[PDB]
Design a protein around this ligand. Structure first.
Ligand code: MG
Ligand code: MG
Lengths: 436, 413, 437, 411
C-alpha cells in the first residue's frame, strides 16, 4: 500500500528527535592501539564505549596524528595476508563452496569491521563522513589511501540507501538548526547573518529544496536552488538581479534550476539515485501546476580547461588556423566587452562547445563535463547553449562565460536516462547537435 | 506463471542492467514472478542461486593470478570484489523493487525452509545474512507502544505472530493491551513497514508471578497503573522467520524498562515469566544416558510420572517430581551449552544477553498444552535492574559468565 | 506555506490533543445541589473536580434521577426572572448601551454557565453530548426541556466549529479503537466481529470516510460509505450483493455514495458545514483521478408519509380520479412483484415524487425531504428518480421503493448551494423538472 | 482603497447572507478591506460597530412586549436572542474567512488601542471578549518545547515578543535555546497557527538567583541537564495584544515544571526570578499621599536617594534603600490591590494565581534601564511546588488568601 509514506515519516521523526538528543587529543599510535581493542571486543556496551572514545580521540588529534591513523588503516588494517594466501591455495586446489567462501572472508580488510563498529557510537556516521573526507584529501600525497577510501564507499553505499532519501522545501518554516546549515551551504547568493538568509528565502519567485537521509539527521545532503519565472533564461546576471522586480508563483510557467550542490564532502561519489531532479519537479508541479516547463541554467566547469588542452594540440581533429586565430582572442582580460570580438567568437565557441558535450567523453564511457553527466544522467536534455551567460570573472575562466540549458520533461525523463545508460545516446536538442 | 528457467534468465538480465528505471522494473517483475512460481519452479530458482550465481570464476581466476603475480593493494582489493557471489548483487537489486525487502525476507524464509532437504541452499542463506545484517541496522530500530489505539492491520499481525501464549481471537487480544494494568511494546524498522520485528507483552502488577494462567485468564480484575509496582515481561516474540539470526541488539529490554519507568515511575521492579523451549528436548535426550554425572538409578523413577495425560493436578505423582526436575533445570541453565559455548536455551540466551539474571525456577508454572511439550510446564523468572544490565551483559559477553541467583547456583547437582 | 502549513500545524496539535485524550449514584436533588456549588465556585481546581463529580453522578444516577435533573435544568437553572425584569424596566426607561448590555446578561439562563463548566471535566464534551441526547429523547414527554436543548445548541455550535473538522479515510490501517466504534455505527452492511468489518472494508471497490473533530477525540461524527463503479446505479441490491465480483479501484470511473450517517444522537441539528461531500469528492479524485462522475444512490424517507397525506387529502392539489384509482395498487402485499402493476405505477409515482422534491417544502421553506435538504445543500443536483430501486421491506415503507441519485459536479457545488440557500432554487435536472405538473 | 462606509455596507451584506461559500467570500473581502484602509475609515468602521451594530431595537422591543404579555420560557429565550448585539454575528461570520481568527485578534488590538480616545468602543471589546473566551478553549492549549530545532518563523516571533529581558538578534536568541543549561516552552492553540500565545524561558541551574545579570550573560559556563537540581523561570511572555484579558488557564506553570521534571528528574526545586512592573507607578504615586501609614517622615527621607539618576552604582547610599523598599514591597504585595480584591501586581496575580508562593524580594536584582523604570531594579521570587500549587490557587480564588513566605510577611 501507500501507508509506507506515513510509517517512514513517523519513524524518521522518532529517529531525528532521538538524534537531537545525544575528548583529549590522542596520538596516531594510541588510536591504532584503540582500534585493535575495539576489533576484539565482544560486549556491546564496552563496544560503543570504545567506539565513541576512538571517535573523540580522532576528532581531537593533531592533523599529524590523524594522518598517522589514516595511513595505518592502509598498512595495519587491510586483510590478513597469511590467511588470504592459505585461502587462495585452497581455492586453487579445489574451487569448492567452502573455499570460495573463506576466500571472500579472508580478502575483506579489517578496516570494514572497524568502520562498521565505529558507526555504533552516537554521532558515528557523521564522524565517519568527516573521516572519509580526510582520506579523500590525502589520496594525492598518499595514493595508498585510495584503497582505504574504497571500503568507506562500499559501506556508505549500503547505509545511504536511496529508498530512505526524502525531499523537503527549505522555506522560512524550516527548523532553525537546518537553515543555519543553509547559510553555510548557500552557493550563489550571499548570506552572513539570519537577516540575509530570511531575505534570501523571502522572494516568492525563488525556491529551494533539500534531500535528507535518516543516516544524517537534519542534514540537507543535496541542495536544490530554483528560480520561478515565465521565460527560460540564457544569462545568470538577470536571475540574481538584486534590484529587479520579483513576480508571483501563479505568475510563472518555467521553473529554472540555477544551482544544485552536494553539501557533504565525505559523500562525494556516493549515488543517491538518478531520478532526484524528477522528484524536485513533481513537488513544484504539485504546488504550482501552472509551471509548464522545467529548465536548468547550469554552468559548464571543465570546458575552459578543455579548450586549453584541445587548442594546445596544434593537430586538432577539427580546429584549423582560421579558427585558432580569432579563437585565442579569449587570451585577454576583457574581450566580452568589444561587441565586435563577441559576435566573432560566438559561432566558433558554440561550435567547439557542442563538441565538448555530445562528442567529448571522459575516462569511462561517459560525458567529460561533470554537470552534464549529472543532469543528463537525470534524464534531462541538452536543450540550448547560452553564449556569455555568465561574464563573472569566475565563469569567464571556468567556461569562458559559456552556460547551457538542460530541459527536464516529466514525460521522457526516464526515457532519456535508459538511453544514456543502456546505449550512450546523449539526449540533445537538434539545434545544438547540428554544430558538429 | 514463470518457470525456474525464466526466473533464472530474468535474474541474469537484471544483473547486467545499467538503467535505474529499467532495473527496478525488472526487479519488480522477477519478485512478482517468483511469488507466482510453483514450489518446483521456486526450488529451481533458489537452486540456480546456489550454483549458477556464486562468484564468477573466470574473473576470480584472473584476480587471483594477478594477486599471485603482484600482491599489491589494488590486487588485494580486486580479489575481494571478484570473490563476491553474484547472488549478492542480485539480492541488492531486487531490493530496489517496491516491497522488495519484505519480498526478500520471504524468500529467505523459503531457503531457511528448504535447507534440510537441499543443504546447498545454505550458501545462499549466508549472503542474505550478510546484506540483512547491514540493512537492519539497530540504530533505526524504534520502540513503539502498542495498544488498542494501534492500527488494526498491525494488531492483526500480533495475533498471528504471538509465539509464547497463543492469542485466539481479537477479544483475547484486546484483553492483553486494553486494561490499564497491561502493556505492550514493539520494535519497528524502516526496512519493513507496519511489521513489528519484536514485540513484548508486559503485565503491570504488585508481585513477581510464577504461573501465567493468573495473568492470562479473562477473569481477575485490573488495577490502576500508579498502583502497580512491578512490570512483568510474560511474552517475547521475534516475528520474522526470514530474520532468524539477525541480531537487533542486546539492550532491547533495557529500553522497554526505561520506557515503563518514565511513564509509571511507580514501577521499580522488573522481571519476566519466561518459557524454556529446549528443556523437554534436553531432558529427553539426557534420558538415554550412556553415562552422565546427572541421572542415576533412583532417577528415571519419578521421570515416568511425566508421561501422563495430566500428572500436574494430582499432588500425589508430581510433588515428588518437583525437586528432581528443578535440580536438573538448574543444570540445564548453568551448565548445558550450545555448539557455540553459549547457554543451551534460546530464551536464556536472549535475557541473559539483555543483562537479566536467572532469579527463580517455577516448577509447572504453565499447564497449557504448549508448556507441557516444551519443558513440562516449567518456567523461570529473569530479573532486570537498570544498574546491573550493562555489567551482566558485559560479564556474560566478555567472559561467558552466566548471571544467576544463589538460590539457583546451588540446585546444581 | 499557509494552506499546507496550517494543515501541518493543525494536524500536529490535534495529534497531541489525541494522545492526551487517549463515581457513586446520586439523587436528582444531590445533582441539583452540586450544580449549585459548581456554579458558585471560583477556583479552577475545585471547579473541575466538582464538574467531574457531577458528570459521574449523573452517569450513575437512576433514570428517574437523571430525568429529574434534566427537568431541574429547565425550571431551576433558567434566567433569574427578578433581575431580568429589573433590566427590562431599566432599558424601557432609557435604552442605553449599559441597559442592553445588562439585559443580554440578565436573559442568559444559568444553564449555560453550568454546561460551560461541566465541559472542563475530562470527558466533559462527550458526556454533554450523551446528556443532550437524553434531553432530546425527552422533549415529547417533557416539552419544557426544549428550552434546555436551545442552550446546548448555542454552546455546541460554538464548540464544534467546522474549521477543525477533519476527513479521514477509514480502513484496516485505521486504529482498532476507532474501528470498534465503527462496528456499531455501520448502517448498510451487516457486521458482527472483526472478520466482518475487515471483510466489509477489504474490497478494492469500497471506501468509507469519516469526519473527526478534536472536541470528540477518536470519534467519527459523520460516516460516509462509497462504492467504486463504472456506472451510476438505480438500485442498491446489486451494490450490496456480497455474491458480486469486485473491480479494481483503478478500473472504476464512478464514485457512488450509498450511505451517509450522523453517528452522535446528541449532535443532531448541529451543522458541520454544507461542503462536506465536496471534501470527500476532492479526496477520492486525488487518490483515483480515474473517476469522473460523482453520484449518490440516496433514499427518500418521508416520501411515503407525504404521499399518504396527499391521498387522505380529499382536495389534493394533483390527484385526479385516475391517479387516485391507480395509487390503490400501492396498498397491496407485493405489487412490485407484478411487472404489469409496476409499469402502471411508475409514471404516476415518479411524477408525484417530482412535485414532492421540487414543490414540497418544510415548516420553513426548505425542501421537505431531509435527504434532499442535505445533498442539495451540499451543492448537489437532483439527477434521477429510481422507481423501485429498493424493494427491501424498509425502503417500501419509507418511499415505496423509490430511490434517487443526486449528482455531484465538482464545478457547480458552490453554484448550486448558493442558489438553494440564497434564492431557494432547487438544482434539478430537466429529466425530472419537466416531469412535474 | 476602501472607505469605512463601504465596509459598513459590506458587513450589512454579510449579516444577511445565507449562502456559505459567498458568506466566507464576503468575510474575506471585508477583513482585507478593513486591513488595508486609511486610519480614518478604520475608526469609522469600528465606531459603526459600537453604533449601527448593537442589538436590533425593533426586535428587542417586540421581544420585550411578548415577555411582559407572557413571561413564558419561549418568550424569555426569545428575549435573550434579541438582546445579542449584531456585532457578535458579524465577528462570528468574519471568523470563517481563511485567517479570520488572526485578523480578528488584530482588529481587537485596534479597538483596545483606540478605547482611551473613544470609550464607546469598550462596548465592541465586550463582544470580542465574549467570543474569544469561547473560541480559545483552554483544553486545546498545547505545551511545546521551543529550542533551536524550532521552525524559524516561530523563533522569529519569540524574538519579536520577548517582554521580560529583550533579545536583540538570533545569536543572542540561540543562546537561550541551544545551551544545554537552558530551556524554553511555548503554549500553542489551534486557533492561531505557529503563534506562541504564552512562552516561558527557564534557566536550568542548581540554586535560586536574585539577579538576572548572571543569567543572561553570554560569558558563562554551561551545565549538563542532569547537573541541575533547580529550574529558574526568568522570563514569561503573553504574546497577543489582542488576547489581552483572556485567560488560558491558571495551571500553565504546573504544566511546565511537570514537563521539566519528567525529562530531568534531577530537578526538585522550581523557582522564578520575576519582575514587579506595578512598583514604579505605585511608589511614584505613593509619595503624593495626603496620608500613608507606610510612609512617614523618617521614611520619605531615606527614600529620597532613589530620586537621583544613578544611585545603583555606589555601595554607599544604597544600603538605606534596602530596608525601606523591602518593607514597602512586602506591603504593596500582601496589601495593595487593584479595582478588585486581587493583588495590584500583574506578575504576582499571575504567579500566585498559578499556585506559587512569594518566597523572597531579591533587592535590586535588575540593573537594566527598564528594570529601574518599574521595580527600581527590584525583583521577587515565586516558589512552585508540585504539592501546594492547587492548594495555593484555591485559597487565592476562593478566599483571596495570598500565599507568601514568613520571611516576606513581617516586612
Ligand atoms: Mg559488505
Ligand atoms: Mg453567547
Amino acid at each position: 500500500a501507500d501507508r509506507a509514506s506515513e510509517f517512514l515519516g513517523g519513524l524518521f521523526n522518532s529517529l531525528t528527535e532521538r538524534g537531537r538528543s545525544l575528548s583529549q587529543p590522542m596520538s596516531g599510535d594510541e588510536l591504532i592501539a584503540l582500534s585493535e581493542t575495539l576489533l576484539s571486543r565482544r560486549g556491546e556496551a564496552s563496544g560503543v564505549a570504545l567506539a565513541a572514545s576512538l571517535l573523540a580521540g580522532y576528532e581531537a588529534a593533531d592533523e599529524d596524528d590523524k594522518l598517522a591513523f589514516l595511513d595505518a588503516l592502509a598498512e595495519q588494517f587491510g586483510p590478513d595476508l597469511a590467511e588470504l594466501n592459505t585461502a587462495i591455495e585452497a581455492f586453487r586446489a579445489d574451487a569448492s563452496a567452502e573455499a570460495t567462501g573463506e576466500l571472500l572472508r579472508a580478502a575483506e580488510p579489517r578496516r570494514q569491521e572497524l568502520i562498521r563498529r565505529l558507526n555504533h557510537a552516537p554521532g558515528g556516521t557523521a564522524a565517519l563522513v568527516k573521516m572519509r573526507e580526510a582520506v579523500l584529501a590525502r589520496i594525492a600525497a598518499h595514493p595508498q589511501l585510495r584503497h582505504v577510501d574504497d571500503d568507506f564507499v562500499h559501506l556508505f553505499t549500503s547505509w545511504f540507501n536511496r529508498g530512505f532519501l526524502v525531499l523537503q522545501r527549505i522555506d522560512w518554516t524550516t527548523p532553525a538548526n537546518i537553515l543555519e546549515k543553509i547559510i553555510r551551504y548557500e552557493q550563489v547568493h550571499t548570506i552572513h547573518d539570519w537577516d540575509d538568509l530570511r531575505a534570501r528565502l523571502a522572494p516568492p519567485d525563488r525556491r529551494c529544496y533539500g534531500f535528507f537521509h535518516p543516516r544524517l539527521v537534519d542534514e540537507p545532503l543535496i541542495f536544490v536552488e530554483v528560480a520561478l519565472t515565465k521565460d527560460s533564461p540564457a544569462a545568470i546576471a538577470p536571475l540574481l538581479d538584486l534590484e529587479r522586480e520579483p513576480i508571483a508563483a501563479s505568475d510563472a510557467t518555467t521553473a529554472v534550476f540555477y544551482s544544485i550542490s552536494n553539501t557533504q564532502q565525505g559523500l562525494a561519489g556516493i549515488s543517491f539515485g538518478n531520478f532526484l531532479i524528477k522528484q524536485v519537479v513533481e513537488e513544484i508541479k504539485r504546488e504550482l501546476p501552472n509551471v509548464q516547463t522545467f529548465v536548468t541554467l547550469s554552468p559548464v566547469p571543465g570546458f575552459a580547461k578543455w579548450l586549453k588542452r584541445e587548442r594546445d594540440n596544434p593537430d586538432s581533429t577539427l580546429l584549423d588556423a582560421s579558427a585558432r586565430t580569432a579563437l585565442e582572442a579569449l587570451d585577454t582580460p576583457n574581450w566580452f566587452d568589444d561587441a565586435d570580438t563577441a559576435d566573432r567568437l560566438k559561432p566558433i565557441v558554440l561550435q567547439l562547445a557542442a563538441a565538448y558535450f555530445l562528442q567529448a567523453k571522459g575516462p569511462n564511457g561517459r560525458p567529460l563535463d561533470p554537470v552534464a553527466r549529472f543532469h543528463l544522467g537525470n534524464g534531462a536534455r541538452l536543450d540550448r547553449l547560452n553564449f556569455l551567460g555568465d561574464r563573472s570573472p569566475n565563469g569567464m575562466r571556468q567556461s569562458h562565460g559559456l552556460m547551457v540549458n538542460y530541459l527536464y520533461a516529466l514525460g521522457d525523463i526516464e526515457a532519456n536516462h535508459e538511453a544514456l545508460f543502456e546505449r550512450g545516446q546523449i539526449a540533445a536538442a537538434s539545434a545544438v547537435r547540428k554544430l558538429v
